């Protein structure tokens, strides 16, 4: 999905359910849960799958139950959310085509959830863990199994969790409290995307300024390793004009002309 | 010759003229003339001919009649100065296979001693012109001919004469004045073979430094042109970090290793 | 022609010829020349006598052989430049009715310089001179 952040709305009702998934929506999110803890979830959930369905990835949180699953898939869920790894519950949910993303906290248990077929990781709760418990844990897991931060992410530290390795993020409590305003949910929602996609482009160019940076060093690696080579022939460069160099034409101010520089090397040569 | 610089002995007298070429030639020269106004050169002449004529260029200077070239070429002479250009006299010295360098001090005055067969030129004297005089002649001058200064060269100002592009320098007053003693021409002949090759090896240095320096400008340039073709695919590297790169590698400091610098560029090439 | 200097294009190239004397010519230049000296100059040459030979004194400069004179006569040149006074050199451009603009550095050479024909005088290089030497022979130069 778009924007890999999951909207978890836990004790939504379903008078208010298609309003508050309304907002997330329309400000980014393309994920959304409800817990099956939430108030007559199962007038909540099928609202929701049948006006936003095709929208955004619908599903439910808090699905302990292979039987759960069974009634989530008849209501139209795609998405399945657990707080735990219940091996049924995955192979179940895996088994009528939907996303399963569900919860460990342990190296244990995250195999466990990819040996019942989990594509995906919830580390909950990751608060209590931290960034650098996720950061150890993608030494071991397979390259390609995305993992969620869940638990105490806010739009000021969800940076942390994406340069830990997170995949991406499920926003609870920090998002949506049963009983907040539907301009609370937009407001929150709004915050989340904005970090996510600030966060993402702080990230980017940072992984392009690294990519940028090495470049230099190969080079300054050829050159020092080039001088050596002189050195042997009995030549000896003045190596701060070198550099004065390489810093004048880059910042287009050689003292020397194109077609000098390109004579002084023939010179050079002989 | 090995060293170009030619000692020029005026009013040297016989009885003096060995011990001070002796002089002269232990200290580094290989080029020596006196001058046909010194007292009884054709005494002086084929003396230092016979005892230094197979370790040094040995002659004759102020050589103004076609006539005492030929009295001299059966001296065993094997250089010809003059402070003048007269056609006959260049001519005639050519015609015995002897090196000539004849006094100039125009443009027109060069080219018709070339045209006499001059193979080198005397800036007779230099002084009055200066080093620029010559850089300026040089400048029309066919490239293999060597200038030599003449007139108020010293130690100390030899090496601008070299910078302006004077192949070497003749010598007189300020090497011998009649009448000093062996050891004084000991000394100044010293003084003189030192400041060449002292001027000498700092200019081989400059050149060898200016060498070295472009070879960054062509760099920086290489690197200035793959930035721009990387921003029209929407990359922009961070420049600071791309010479700092530089900058480590070629100190032995490079924050990657020679294995993270390829796998990073080999990412960036994806 | 109306102004009295003269571009020098030591060592330019055919391929950038017409360019910079464009320049020259544009910023109001009209008289310009090539020192034999130059790479290719017998491409050059003949390709700025053809493009801006109407707009401007073309020639050559760093004559130094009678026959050199004689191959930019038929290249179209219309002005001999010099570093020295050669009187063949320069009896010859006045025989092709070419403007002449030879080089001395001496008393002495003018006078030569004018009694092989020459109308005027490049006091070369004038630098070590000054301004002064310039007076000093213009008090006996007609």
Redesign the interface.
Request: hydrophobic share 45%.
């Given at each position: 999905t778009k924007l890999p952040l999951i909207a978890i709305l836990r004790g939504i009702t379903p008078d208010e359910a298609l309003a508050h998934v309304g907002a997330v929506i329309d400000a980014g999110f393309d994920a959304v849960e409800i817990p099956l803890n939430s108030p007559q979830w199962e007038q909540s959930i099928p609202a929701i799958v049948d006006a936003y369905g095709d929208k955004a990835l619908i599903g439910a949180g808090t699905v302990l139950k292979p039987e759960q699953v069974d009634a989530l898939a008849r209501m139209g869920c795609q998405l399945i959310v657990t707080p735990n790894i219940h091996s049924e519950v995955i192979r179940r949910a895996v088994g009528y085509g939907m996303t399963v993303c569900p919860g460990c906290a342990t190296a244990t248990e995250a195999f466990t959830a990819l040996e019942a077929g989990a594509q995906a990781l919830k580390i909950f709760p990751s608060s209590a863990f931290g960034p650098q418990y996720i950061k150890a844990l993608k030494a071991v897991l397979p390259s390609d199994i995305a993992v969620f931060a869940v638990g105490g992410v806010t739009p000021e530290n969800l940076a942390q969790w994406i340069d830990a390795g997170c995949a991406g993020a499920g926003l609870g409590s920090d998002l949506y409290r049963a009983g907040q305003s539907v301009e609370r949910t937009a407001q929150q929602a709004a915050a989340f995307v904005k970090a996510y996609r600030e966060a993402q482009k702080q990230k980017e160019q940072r992984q392009?300024?690294?990519?940028?940076?090495?470049?230099?060093?190969?080079?300054?690696?050829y050159?020092?390793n080039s001088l050596k080579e002189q050195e042997k022939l009995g030549?000896?460069?003045?190596?701060d004009?070198?550099?004065?160099?390489?810093?004048?034409?880059?910042?287009?101010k050689?003292?020397?002309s194109?077609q000098?520089?390109?004579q002084?090397?023939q010179?050079?040569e002989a």
């Open positions: 392009d300024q690294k990519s940028a940076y090495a470049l230099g060093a190969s080079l300054g690696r050159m020092e030549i000896k460069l003045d190596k004009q070198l550099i004065a160099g390489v810093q004048d034409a880059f910042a287009d050689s003292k020397l194109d000098e520089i390109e002084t090397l010179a050079f």
